[PDB]
PDB file of C-alpha atoms and ligand atoms in Angstrom:
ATOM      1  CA  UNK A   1     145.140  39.429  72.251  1.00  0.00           C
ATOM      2  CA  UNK A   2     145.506  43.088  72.871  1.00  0.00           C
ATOM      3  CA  UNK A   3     142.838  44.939  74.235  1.00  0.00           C
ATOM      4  CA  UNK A   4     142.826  48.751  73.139  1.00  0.00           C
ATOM      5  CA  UNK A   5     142.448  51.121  75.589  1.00  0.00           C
ATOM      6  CA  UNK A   6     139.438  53.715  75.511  1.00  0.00           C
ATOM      7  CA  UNK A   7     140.053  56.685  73.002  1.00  0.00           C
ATOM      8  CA  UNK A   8     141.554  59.971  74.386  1.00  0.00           C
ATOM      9  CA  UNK A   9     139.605  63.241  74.113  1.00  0.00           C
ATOM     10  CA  UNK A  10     139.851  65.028  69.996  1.00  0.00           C
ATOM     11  CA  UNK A  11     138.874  68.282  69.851  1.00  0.00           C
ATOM     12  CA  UNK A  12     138.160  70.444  67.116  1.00  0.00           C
ATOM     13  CA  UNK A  13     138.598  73.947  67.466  1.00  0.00           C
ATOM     14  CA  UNK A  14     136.983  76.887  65.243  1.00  0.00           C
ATOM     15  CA  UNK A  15     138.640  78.923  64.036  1.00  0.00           C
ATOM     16  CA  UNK A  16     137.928  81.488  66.909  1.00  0.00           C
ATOM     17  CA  UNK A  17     138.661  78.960  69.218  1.00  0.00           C
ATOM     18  CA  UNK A  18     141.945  78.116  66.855  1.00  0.00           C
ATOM     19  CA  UNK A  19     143.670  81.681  67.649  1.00  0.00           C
ATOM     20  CA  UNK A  20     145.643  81.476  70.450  1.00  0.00           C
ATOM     21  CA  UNK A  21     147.234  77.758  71.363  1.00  0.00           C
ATOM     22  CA  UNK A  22     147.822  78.829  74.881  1.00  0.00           C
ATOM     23  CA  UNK A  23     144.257  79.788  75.676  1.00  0.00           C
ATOM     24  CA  UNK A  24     142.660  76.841  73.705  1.00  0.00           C
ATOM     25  CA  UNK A  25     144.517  74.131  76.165  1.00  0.00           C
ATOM     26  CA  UNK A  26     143.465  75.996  79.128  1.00  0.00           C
ATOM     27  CA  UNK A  27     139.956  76.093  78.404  1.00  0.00           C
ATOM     28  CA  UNK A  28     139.884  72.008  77.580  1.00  0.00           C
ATOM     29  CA  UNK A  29     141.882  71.490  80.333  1.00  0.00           C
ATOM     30  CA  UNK A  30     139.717  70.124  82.856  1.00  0.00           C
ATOM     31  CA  UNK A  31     139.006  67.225  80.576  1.00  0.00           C
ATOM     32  CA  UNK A  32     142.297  66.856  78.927  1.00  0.00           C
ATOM     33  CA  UNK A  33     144.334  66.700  82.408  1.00  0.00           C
ATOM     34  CA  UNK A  34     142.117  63.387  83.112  1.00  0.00           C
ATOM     35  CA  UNK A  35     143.304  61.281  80.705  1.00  0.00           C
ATOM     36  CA  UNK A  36     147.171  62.643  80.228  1.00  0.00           C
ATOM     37  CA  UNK A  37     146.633  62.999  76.073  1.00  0.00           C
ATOM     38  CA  UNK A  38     144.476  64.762  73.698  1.00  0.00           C
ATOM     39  CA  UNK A  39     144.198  65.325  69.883  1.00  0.00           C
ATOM     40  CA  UNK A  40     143.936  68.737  68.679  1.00  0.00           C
ATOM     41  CA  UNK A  41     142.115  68.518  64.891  1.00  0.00           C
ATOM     42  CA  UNK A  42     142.856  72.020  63.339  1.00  0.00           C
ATOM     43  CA  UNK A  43     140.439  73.715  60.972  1.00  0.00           C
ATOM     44  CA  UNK A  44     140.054  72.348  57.870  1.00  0.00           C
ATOM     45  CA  UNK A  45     141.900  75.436  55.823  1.00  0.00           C
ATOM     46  CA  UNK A  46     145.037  75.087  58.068  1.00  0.00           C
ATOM     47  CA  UNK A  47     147.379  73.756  56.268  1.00  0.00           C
ATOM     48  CA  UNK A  48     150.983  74.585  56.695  1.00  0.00           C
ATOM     49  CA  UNK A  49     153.625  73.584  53.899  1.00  0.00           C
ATOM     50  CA  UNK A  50     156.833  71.173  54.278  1.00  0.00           C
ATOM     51  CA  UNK A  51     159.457  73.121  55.147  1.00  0.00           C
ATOM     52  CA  UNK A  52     162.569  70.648  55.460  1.00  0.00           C
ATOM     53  CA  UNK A  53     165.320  71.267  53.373  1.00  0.00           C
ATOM     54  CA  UNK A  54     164.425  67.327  51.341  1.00  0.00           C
ATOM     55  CA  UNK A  55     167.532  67.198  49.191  1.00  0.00           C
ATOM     56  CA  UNK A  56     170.252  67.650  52.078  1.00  0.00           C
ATOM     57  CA  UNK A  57     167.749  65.384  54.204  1.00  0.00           C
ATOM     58  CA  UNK A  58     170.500  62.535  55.311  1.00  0.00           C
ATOM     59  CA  UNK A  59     170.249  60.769  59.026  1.00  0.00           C
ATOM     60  CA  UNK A  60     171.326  57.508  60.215  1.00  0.00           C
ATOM     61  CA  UNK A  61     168.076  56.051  62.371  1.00  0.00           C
ATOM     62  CA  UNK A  62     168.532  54.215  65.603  1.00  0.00           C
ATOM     63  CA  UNK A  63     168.139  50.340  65.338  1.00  0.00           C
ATOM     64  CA  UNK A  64     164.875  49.117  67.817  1.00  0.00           C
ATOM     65  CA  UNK A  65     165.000  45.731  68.465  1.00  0.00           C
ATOM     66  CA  UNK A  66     161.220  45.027  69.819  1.00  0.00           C
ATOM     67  CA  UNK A  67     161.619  42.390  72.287  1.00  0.00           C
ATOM     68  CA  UNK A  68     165.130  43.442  73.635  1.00  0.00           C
ATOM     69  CA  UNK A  69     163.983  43.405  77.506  1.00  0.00           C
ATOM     70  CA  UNK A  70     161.881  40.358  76.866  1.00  0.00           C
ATOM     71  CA  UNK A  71     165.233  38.684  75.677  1.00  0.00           C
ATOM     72  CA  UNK A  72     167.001  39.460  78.936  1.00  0.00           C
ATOM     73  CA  UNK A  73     165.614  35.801  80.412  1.00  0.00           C
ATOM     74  CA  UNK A  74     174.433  42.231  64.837  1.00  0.00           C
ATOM     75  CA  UNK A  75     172.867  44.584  62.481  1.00  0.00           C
ATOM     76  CA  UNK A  76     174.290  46.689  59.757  1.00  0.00           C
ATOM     77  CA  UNK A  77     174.507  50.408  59.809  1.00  0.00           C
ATOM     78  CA  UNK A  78     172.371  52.244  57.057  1.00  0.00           C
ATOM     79  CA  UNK A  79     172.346  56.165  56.235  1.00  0.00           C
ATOM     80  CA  UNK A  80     169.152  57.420  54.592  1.00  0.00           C
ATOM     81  CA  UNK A  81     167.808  60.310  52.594  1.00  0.00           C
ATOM     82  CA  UNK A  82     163.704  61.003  53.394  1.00  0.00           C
ATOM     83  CA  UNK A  83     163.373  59.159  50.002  1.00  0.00           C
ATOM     84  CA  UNK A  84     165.490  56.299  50.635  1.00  0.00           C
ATOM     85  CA  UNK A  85     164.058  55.759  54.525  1.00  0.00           C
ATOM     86  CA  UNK A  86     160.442  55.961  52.942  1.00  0.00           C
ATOM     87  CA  UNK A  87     161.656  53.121  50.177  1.00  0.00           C
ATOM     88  CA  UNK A  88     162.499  51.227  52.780  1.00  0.00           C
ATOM     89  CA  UNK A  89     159.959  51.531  55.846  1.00  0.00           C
ATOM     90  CA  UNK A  90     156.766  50.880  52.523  1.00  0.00           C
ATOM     91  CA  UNK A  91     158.698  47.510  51.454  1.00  0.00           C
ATOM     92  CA  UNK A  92     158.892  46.588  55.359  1.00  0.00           C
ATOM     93  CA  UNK A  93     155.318  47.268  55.901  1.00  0.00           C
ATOM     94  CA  UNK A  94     154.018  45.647  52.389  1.00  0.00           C
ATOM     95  CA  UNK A  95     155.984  42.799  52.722  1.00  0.00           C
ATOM     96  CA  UNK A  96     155.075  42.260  56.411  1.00  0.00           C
ATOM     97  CA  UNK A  97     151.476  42.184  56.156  1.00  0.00           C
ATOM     98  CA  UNK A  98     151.653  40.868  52.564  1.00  0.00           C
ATOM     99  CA  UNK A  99     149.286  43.841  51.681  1.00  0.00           C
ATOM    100  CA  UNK A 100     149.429  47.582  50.485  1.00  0.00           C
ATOM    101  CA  UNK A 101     150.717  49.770  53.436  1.00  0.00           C
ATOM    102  CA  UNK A 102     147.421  51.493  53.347  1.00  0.00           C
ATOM    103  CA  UNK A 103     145.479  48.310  53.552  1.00  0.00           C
ATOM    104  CA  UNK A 104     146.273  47.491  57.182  1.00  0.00           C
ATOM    105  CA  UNK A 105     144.113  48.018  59.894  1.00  0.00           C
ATOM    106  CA  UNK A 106     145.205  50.252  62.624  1.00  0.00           C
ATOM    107  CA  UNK A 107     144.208  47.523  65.052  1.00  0.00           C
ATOM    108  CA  UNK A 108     146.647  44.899  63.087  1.00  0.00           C
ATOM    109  CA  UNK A 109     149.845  47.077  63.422  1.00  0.00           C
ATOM    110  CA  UNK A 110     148.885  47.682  67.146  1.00  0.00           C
ATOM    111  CA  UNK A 111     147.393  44.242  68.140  1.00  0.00           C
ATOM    112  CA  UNK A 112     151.073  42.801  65.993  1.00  0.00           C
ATOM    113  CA  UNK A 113     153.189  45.356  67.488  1.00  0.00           C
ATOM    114  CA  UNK A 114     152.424  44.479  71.333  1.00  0.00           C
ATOM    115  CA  UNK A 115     152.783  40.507  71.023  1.00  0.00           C
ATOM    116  CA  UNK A 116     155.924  41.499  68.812  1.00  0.00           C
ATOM    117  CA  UNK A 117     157.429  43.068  71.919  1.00  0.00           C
ATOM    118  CA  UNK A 118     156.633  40.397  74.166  1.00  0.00           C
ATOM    119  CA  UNK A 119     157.660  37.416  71.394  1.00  0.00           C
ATOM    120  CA  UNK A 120     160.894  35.121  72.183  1.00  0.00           C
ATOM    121  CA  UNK A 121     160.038  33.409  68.918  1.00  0.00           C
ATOM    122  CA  UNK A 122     160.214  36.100  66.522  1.00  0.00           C
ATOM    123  CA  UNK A 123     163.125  39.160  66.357  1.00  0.00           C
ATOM    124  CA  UNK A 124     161.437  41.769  64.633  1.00  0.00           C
ATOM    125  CA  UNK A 125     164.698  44.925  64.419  1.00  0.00           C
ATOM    126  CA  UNK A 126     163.173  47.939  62.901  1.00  0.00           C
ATOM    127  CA  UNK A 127     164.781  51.609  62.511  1.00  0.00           C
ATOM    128  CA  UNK A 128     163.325  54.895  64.116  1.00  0.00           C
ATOM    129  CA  UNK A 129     165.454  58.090  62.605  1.00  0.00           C
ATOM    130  CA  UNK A 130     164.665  59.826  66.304  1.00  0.00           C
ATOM    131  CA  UNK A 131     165.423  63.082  67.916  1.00  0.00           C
ATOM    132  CA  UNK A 132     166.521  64.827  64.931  1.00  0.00           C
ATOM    133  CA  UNK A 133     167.805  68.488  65.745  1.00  0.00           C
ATOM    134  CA  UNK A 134     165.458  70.940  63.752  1.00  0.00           C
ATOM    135  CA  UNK A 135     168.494  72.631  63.793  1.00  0.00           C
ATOM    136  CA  UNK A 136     170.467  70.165  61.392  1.00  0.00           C
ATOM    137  CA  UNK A 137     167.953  70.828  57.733  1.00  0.00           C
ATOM    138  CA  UNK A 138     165.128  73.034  59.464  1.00  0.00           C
ATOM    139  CA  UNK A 139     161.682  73.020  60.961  1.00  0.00           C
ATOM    140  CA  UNK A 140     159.166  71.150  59.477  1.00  0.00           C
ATOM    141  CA  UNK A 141     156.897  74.613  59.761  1.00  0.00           C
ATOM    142  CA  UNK A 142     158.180  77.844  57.529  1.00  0.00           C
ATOM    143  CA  UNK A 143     160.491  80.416  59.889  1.00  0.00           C
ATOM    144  CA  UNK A 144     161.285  83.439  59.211  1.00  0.00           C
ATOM    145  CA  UNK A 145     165.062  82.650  59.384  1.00  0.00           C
ATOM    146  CA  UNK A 146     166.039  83.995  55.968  1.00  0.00           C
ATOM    147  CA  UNK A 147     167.602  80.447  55.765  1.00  0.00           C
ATOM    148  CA  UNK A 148     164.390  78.948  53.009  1.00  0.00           C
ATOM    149  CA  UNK A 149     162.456  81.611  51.227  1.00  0.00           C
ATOM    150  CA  UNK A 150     158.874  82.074  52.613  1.00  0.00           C
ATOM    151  CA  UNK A 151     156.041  82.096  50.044  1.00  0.00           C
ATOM    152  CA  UNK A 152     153.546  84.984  50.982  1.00  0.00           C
ATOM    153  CA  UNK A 153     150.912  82.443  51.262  1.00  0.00           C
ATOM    154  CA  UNK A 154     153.129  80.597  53.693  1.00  0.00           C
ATOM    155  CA  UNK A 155     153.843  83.597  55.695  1.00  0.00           C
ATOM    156  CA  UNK A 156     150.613  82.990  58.123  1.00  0.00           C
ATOM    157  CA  UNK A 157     152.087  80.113  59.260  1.00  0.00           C
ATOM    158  CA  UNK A 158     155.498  81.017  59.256  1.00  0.00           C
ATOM    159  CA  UNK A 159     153.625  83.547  62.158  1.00  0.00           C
ATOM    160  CA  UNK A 160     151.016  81.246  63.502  1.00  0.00           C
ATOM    161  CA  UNK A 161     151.113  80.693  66.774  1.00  0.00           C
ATOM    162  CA  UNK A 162     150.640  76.973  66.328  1.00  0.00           C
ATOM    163  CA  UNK A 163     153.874  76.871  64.327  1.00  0.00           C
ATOM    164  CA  UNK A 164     156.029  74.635  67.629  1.00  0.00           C
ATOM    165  CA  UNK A 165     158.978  77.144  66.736  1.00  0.00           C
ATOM    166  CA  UNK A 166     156.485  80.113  68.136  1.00  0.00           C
ATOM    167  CA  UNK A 167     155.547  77.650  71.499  1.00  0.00           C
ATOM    168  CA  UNK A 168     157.054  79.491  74.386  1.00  0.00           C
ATOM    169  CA  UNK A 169     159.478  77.526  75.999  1.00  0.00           C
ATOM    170  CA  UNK A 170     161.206  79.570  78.501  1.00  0.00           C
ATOM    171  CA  UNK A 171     160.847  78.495  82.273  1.00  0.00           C
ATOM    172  CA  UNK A 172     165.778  75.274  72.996  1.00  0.00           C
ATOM    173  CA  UNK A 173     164.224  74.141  69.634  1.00  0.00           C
ATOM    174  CA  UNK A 174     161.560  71.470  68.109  1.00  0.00           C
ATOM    175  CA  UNK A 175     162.929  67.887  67.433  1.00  0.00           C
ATOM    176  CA  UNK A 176     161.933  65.491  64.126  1.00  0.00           C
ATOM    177  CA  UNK A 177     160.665  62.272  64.275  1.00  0.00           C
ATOM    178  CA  UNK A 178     161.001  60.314  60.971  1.00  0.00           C
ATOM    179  CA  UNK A 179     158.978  56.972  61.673  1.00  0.00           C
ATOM    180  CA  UNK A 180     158.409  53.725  60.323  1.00  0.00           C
ATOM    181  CA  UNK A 181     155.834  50.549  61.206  1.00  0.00           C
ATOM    182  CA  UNK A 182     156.574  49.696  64.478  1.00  0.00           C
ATOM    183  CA  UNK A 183     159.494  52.343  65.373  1.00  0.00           C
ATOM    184  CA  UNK A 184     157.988  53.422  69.062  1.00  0.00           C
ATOM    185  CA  UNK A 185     158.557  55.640  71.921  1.00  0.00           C
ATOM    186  CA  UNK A 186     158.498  53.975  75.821  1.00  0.00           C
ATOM    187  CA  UNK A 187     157.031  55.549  78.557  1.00  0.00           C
ATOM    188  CA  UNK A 188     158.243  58.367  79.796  1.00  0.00           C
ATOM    189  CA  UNK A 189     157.417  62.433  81.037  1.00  0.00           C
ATOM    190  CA  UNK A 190     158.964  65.440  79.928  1.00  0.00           C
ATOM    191  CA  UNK A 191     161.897  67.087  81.606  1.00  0.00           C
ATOM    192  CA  UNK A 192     160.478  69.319  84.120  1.00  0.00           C
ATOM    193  CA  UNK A 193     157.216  67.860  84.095  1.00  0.00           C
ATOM    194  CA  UNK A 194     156.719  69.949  81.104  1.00  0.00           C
ATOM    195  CA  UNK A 195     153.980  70.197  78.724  1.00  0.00           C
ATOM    196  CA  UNK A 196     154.716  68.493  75.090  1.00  0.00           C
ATOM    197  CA  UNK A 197     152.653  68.972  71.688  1.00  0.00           C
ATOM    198  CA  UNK A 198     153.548  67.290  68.696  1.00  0.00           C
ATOM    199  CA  UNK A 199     152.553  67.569  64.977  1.00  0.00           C
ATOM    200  CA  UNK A 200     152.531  64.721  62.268  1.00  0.00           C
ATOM    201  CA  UNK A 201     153.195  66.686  59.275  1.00  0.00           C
ATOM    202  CA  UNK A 202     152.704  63.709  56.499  1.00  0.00           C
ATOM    203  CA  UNK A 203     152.564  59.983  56.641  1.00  0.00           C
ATOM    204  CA  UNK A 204     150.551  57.478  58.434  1.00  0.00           C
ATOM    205  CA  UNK A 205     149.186  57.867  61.841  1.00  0.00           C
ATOM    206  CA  UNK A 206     151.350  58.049  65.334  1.00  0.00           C
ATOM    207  CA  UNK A 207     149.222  55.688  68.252  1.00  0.00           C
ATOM    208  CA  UNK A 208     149.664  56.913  71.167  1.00  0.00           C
ATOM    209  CA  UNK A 209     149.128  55.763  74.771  1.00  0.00           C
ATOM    210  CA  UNK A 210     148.990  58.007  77.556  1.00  0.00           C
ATOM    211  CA  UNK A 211     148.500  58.288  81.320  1.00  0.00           C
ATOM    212  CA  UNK A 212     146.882  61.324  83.294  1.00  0.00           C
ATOM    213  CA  UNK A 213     149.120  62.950  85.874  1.00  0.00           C
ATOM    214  CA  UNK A 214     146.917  61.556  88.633  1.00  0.00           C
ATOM    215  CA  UNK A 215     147.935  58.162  87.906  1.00  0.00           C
ATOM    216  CA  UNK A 216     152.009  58.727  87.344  1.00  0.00           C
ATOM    217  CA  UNK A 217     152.598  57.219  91.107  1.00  0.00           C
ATOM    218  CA  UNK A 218     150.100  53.911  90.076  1.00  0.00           C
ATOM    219  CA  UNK A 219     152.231  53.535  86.798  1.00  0.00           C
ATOM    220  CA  UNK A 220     155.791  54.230  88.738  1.00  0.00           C
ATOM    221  CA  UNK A 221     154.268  51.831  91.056  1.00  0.00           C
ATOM    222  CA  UNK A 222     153.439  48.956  88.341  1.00  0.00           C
ATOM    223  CA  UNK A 223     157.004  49.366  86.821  1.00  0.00           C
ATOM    224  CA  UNK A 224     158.596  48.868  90.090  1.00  0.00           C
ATOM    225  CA  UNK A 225     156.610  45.417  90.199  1.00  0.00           C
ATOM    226  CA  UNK A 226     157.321  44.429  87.060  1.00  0.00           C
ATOM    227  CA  UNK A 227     159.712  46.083  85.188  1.00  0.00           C
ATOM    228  CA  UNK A 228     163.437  43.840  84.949  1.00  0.00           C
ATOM    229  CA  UNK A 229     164.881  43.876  88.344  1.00  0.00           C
ATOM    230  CA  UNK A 230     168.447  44.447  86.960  1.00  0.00           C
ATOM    231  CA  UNK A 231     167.259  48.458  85.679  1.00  0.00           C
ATOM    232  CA  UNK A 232     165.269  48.810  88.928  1.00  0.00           C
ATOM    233  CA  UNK A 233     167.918  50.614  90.972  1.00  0.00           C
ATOM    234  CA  UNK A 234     168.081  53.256  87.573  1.00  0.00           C
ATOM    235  CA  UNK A 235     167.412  56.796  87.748  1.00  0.00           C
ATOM    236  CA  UNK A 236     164.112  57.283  85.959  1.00  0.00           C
ATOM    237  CA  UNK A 237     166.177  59.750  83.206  1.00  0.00           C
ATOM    238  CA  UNK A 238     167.693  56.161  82.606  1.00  0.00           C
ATOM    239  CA  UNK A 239     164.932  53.956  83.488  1.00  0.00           C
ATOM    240  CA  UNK A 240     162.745  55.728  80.794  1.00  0.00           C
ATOM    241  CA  UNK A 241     165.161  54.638  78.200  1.00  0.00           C
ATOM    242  CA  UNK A 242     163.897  50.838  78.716  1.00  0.00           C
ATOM    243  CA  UNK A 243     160.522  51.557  80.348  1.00  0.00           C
ATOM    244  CA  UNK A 244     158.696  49.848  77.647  1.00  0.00           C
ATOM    245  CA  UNK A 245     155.337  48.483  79.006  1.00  0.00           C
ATOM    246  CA  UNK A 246     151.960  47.067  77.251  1.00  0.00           C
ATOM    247  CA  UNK A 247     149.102  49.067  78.464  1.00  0.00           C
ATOM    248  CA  UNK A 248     146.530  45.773  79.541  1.00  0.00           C
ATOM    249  CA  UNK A 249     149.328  45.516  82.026  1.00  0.00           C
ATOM    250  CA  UNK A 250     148.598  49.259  83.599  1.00  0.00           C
ATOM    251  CA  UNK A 251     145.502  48.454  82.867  1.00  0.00           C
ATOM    252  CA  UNK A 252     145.018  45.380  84.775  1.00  0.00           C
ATOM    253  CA  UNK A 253     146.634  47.419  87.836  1.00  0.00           C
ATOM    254  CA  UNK A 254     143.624  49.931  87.910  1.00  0.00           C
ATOM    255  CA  UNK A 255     145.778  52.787  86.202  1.00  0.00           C
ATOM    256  CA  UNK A 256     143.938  54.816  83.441  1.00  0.00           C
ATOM    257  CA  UNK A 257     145.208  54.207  79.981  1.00  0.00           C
ATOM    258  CA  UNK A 258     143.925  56.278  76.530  1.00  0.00           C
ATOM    259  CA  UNK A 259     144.742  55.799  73.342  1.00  0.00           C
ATOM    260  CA  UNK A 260     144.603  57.813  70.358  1.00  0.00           C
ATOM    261  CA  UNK A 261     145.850  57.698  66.572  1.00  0.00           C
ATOM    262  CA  UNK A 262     147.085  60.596  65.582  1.00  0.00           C
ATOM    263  CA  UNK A 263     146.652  61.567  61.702  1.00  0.00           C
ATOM    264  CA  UNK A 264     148.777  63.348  59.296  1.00  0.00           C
ATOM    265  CA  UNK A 265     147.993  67.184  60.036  1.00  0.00           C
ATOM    266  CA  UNK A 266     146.322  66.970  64.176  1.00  0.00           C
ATOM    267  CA  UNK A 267     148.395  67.862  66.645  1.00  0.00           C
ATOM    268  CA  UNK A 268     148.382  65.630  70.269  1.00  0.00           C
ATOM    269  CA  UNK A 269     149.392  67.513  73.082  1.00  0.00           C
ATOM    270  CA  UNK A 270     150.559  66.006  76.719  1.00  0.00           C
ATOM    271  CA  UNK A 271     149.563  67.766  79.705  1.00  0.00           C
ATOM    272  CA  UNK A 272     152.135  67.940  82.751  1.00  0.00           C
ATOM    273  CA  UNK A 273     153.722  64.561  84.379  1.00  0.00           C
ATOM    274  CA  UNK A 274     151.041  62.640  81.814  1.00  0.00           C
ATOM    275  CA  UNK A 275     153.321  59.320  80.852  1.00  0.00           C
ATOM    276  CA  UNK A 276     152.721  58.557  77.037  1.00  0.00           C
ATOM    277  CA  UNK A 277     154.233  55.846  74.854  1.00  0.00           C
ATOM    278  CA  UNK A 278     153.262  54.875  71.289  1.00  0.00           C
ATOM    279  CA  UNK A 279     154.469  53.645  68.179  1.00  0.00           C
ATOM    280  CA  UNK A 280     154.046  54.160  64.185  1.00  0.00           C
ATOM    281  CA  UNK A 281     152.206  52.801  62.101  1.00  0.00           C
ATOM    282  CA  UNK A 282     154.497  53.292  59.058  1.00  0.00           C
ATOM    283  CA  UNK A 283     156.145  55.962  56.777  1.00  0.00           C
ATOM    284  CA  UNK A 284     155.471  59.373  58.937  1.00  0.00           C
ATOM    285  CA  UNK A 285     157.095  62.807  60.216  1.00  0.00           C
ATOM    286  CA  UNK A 286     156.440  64.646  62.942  1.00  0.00           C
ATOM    287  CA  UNK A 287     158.026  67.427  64.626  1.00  0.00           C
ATOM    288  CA  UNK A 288     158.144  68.098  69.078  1.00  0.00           C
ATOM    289  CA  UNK A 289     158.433  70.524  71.271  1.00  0.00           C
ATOM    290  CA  UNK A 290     158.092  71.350  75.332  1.00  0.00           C
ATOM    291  CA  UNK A 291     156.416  74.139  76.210  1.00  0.00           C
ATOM    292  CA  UNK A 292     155.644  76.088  79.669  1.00  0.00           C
ATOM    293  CA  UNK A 293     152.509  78.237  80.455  1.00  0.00           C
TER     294      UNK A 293
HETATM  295  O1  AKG B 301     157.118  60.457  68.330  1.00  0.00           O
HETATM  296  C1  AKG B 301     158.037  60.091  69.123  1.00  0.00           C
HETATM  297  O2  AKG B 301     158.852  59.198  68.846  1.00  0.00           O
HETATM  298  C2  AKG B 301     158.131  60.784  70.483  1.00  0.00           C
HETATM  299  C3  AKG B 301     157.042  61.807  70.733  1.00  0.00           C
HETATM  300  C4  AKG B 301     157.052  62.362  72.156  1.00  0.00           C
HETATM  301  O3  AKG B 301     157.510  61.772  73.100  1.00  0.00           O
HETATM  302  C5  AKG B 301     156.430  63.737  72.345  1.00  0.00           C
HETATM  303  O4  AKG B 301     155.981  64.376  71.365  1.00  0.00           O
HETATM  304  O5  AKG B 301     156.395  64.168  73.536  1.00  0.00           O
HETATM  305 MN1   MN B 302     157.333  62.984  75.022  1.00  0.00          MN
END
């Protein structure tokens, strides 16, 4: 079966620590940069409201199809409000594992969801509502765009530099991620080699996989072994659209793998050129953004 990689660094930052993002990930990162990922636990007392607009909340999520490469050698189209996608992604999960969502083990969904990908036997086809412009019903975080009114105890994180809309990006706007169990993300680096942080605002966890930079060429290396031969001429803007990999193989290849399972309210941040991939492991929402230094 699956064996799980070692856990990525978690850090938990007081509140001194907790003022300025920017500074806080350069002082951890001569640890962080060695293994790619790294969970960011805020204090306790942080806790920023839901700022979506829910009743206008309507997206049509991409259909994922686990074993898709696997089947190298249908489905009808759905619209969904956040209530209606939630409905939905609980009665997969329950019905699934024949238990409460809550009741599965994080190791189930993740040891399930790897031979899942690699099965010929079974076609699992789950829905990821991906890449969702913040633009399109807001921010998860409060802004002060005059757009939603801003309680006053709201306001210090409307400010906050934590808030991803705050994140300097300049060398463009955060992205939503509503997830189900089993709706995943291949491997793949930011545009620019950028750095990425991302924050699960409610739901069950996000796992994560990630590489540190030092290892990109060993992982580039592994696909180019063993990745379909047909999408190894690609571009790697197109090749990381397929580049969906289970991390005992990178493992077995001497690259350095971590894992981590990221929990409603921690952030996970991805250091420059660090390959990640993960998947859900049900119901969840989390919001994305690149950011330079
Ligand atoms: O959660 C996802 O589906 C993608 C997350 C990601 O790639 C990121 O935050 O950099
Ligand atoms: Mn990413």
């Amino acid at each position: 079966e699956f064996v799980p990689p070692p856990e990525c660094p978690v850090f938990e930052p007081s509140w001194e620590e907790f003022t300025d993002p920017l500074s806080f990930i350069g002082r951890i990162r001569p640890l962080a940069e060695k293994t790619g990922i790294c969970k960011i636990r805020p204090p306790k007392d942080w806790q920023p409201p839901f700022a979506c607009e829910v009743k206008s909340f309507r997206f049509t999520p991409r259909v994922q199809r686990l074993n898709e490469l696997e089947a190298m050698t249908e489905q009808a189209v759905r619209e969904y409000t956040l209530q209606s996608f939630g409905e939905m992604a609980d009665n997969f999960k329950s019905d699934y594992f024949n238990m409460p969502v809550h009741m599965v083990p994080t190791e189930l969904v993740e040891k399930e969801f790897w031979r899942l990908v690699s099965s010929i036997e079974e076609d699992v086809i789950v829905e990821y509502g991906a890449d969702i412009s913040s633009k399109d019903f807001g921010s998860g975080f409060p802004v002060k765009d005059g757009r939603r009114k801003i309680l006053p105890e709201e306001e210090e994180y409307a400010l906050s530099g934590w808030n991803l809309n705050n994140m300097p990006v300049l060398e463009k706007v955060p992205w939503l991620y509503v997830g189900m169990c089993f709706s995943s993300f291949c491997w793949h680096i930011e545009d620019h080699w950028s750095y990425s942080i991302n924050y699960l605002h409610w739901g069950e966890p996000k796992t994560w996989y990630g590489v540190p930079s030092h290892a990109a060429e060993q992982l580039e290396e592994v696909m180019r072994e063993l990745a379909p031969e047909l999408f190894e001429s690609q571009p790697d803007l197109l090749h990381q659209l397929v580049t969906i990999m289970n991390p005992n193989v990178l493992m077995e290849h001497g690259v350095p793998v971590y894992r981590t399972n990221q929990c409603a309210g921690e952030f996970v941040v991805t250091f420059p050129r660090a390959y990640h991939s993960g998947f859900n492991q049900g119901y969840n929402f989390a919001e994305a953004v690149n950011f330079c230094t």
